[model samples]
Target: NAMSQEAFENKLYANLEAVIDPELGVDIVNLGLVYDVTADENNNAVITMTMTSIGCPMAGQIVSDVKKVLSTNVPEVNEIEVNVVWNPPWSKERMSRMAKIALGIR
Candidate 1:
């Protein structure tokens, strides 16, 4: 069953909301790890994201988890390309209220 682009994107984003960061136990979307998500004309997804810490070993697992989640939830996605960055770096400021509260931070 083929889905419309908008529907596919909506479902993709919604499903990504469940991809929890292993260390924080918070979803990447809520943790602000997901900087961008776009699909090419070929329907391959390019995801720009960052980690709480640069060069974290868990990054591999995180990327793997992301690929797994997207592939399982959005079969429409022809391919997944994860672009991990550290330009702006990651901070508590990027976290959502729920994530902050979950971490016992005000």
Candidate 2:
């Protein structure tokens, strides 16, 4: 399908890779912090994500950066609704190979 040829959602994820975690020095996308993303015809985006832990002090920073980065990198994204969570929690398994290598985990 021509509609399926280009990855609209994955493109969003790729753009999100620009947002790196301050502490880990790895993109949040690679770190598996981003859970889900949805967009509407209005170009309004809704993003769901999580942190490594509730104790991590960078929660506020990550939230802000996500909103900021999306608007900057993706011109179509303007009105964004970012939802943060921790109920599912974050684990090493969520980290991508790039993140693992960057973190020096075998």
Candidate 3:
């Protein structure tokens, strides 16, 4: 079932805990790779994200991890389309405040 914006957002946040970046060995929630995560009908997830760099060597593995985690953890999730976005790129500024503190980038 599709969820309302707020409800889906909460679910997304909760489920995001499952996706881990293998290279960084940190969950995307903490590493801050996820720019936006949304779900549509049929519970398919569309995720836009960036890596620590434009040419991150682990790109394929990271995408695979994302698909694996979502498929395995979210019972309602059937498909996960991950888009590796480079535009605007990922800066420390894009990171969550908690992530910044965790990475000690004050």
Candidate 4:
């Protein structure tokens, strides 16, 4: 059987939210690191994301976590690939309200 596209995407994101940035202790979703999430016909997830710092040392670990979390929580994800981009860059304005408070960015 096949699942609806919306359902699949929802599951992907729920699992994606499990990934956390160790340094900030916040989920990547709220941190604005995630740029986009899409899946191919085979259910392979392609994630476009960015780090708070382009040279962030945790890049590898965070990318791994994203794959692990989704693979574990959402079996529909047949494969995972991460694309780290810096074109638009990251800024405090992208953060969620909660993240802002946590980071003392009032």
Each prediction's RMSD to truth: 3.2, 2.8, 2.6, 2.5
Counted clashes in each candidate structure? 0, 0, 0, 0
Estimate every model's Cα lDDT from 0 to 1. Answer: 0.82, 0.81, 0.74, 0.84
Cα lDDT, model 2, residue 78: 58
Highest TM-score: which candidate? Answer: 4
**Alpha-carbon runs more than 4 Å astray in model 2:** 1-6
Sort by TM-score, best first: what order? 4, 2, 1, 3
lDDT (Cα, tens digit) per residue for candidate 2, span 24-51: 8888889999999877656667889998
**lDDT of the structure predicted as candidate 3:** 0.74
TM-score of 4: 0.87
Residues 25-74 of candidate 3: C-alpha lDDT, one tens digit per residue:
56787777787887776566788888889768888887887787777776
Query: Tens digits of per-residue lDDT for model 1 on 7-71?
Result: 56666777788688877778999998888777755678888899998857789988889899999
TM-score winner between 3 and 4, please give it. 4
The segments of candidate 3 whose C-alpha lies over 4 angstroms from its true place after superposition are: 1-6
Of 1 and 4, the candidate ahead on lDDT is 4
Please provide the root mean square deviation of candidate 2 (C-alpha atoms, Å).
2.8
Model 1 deviation from the true structure expressed as Cα RMSD, one decimal place: 3.2
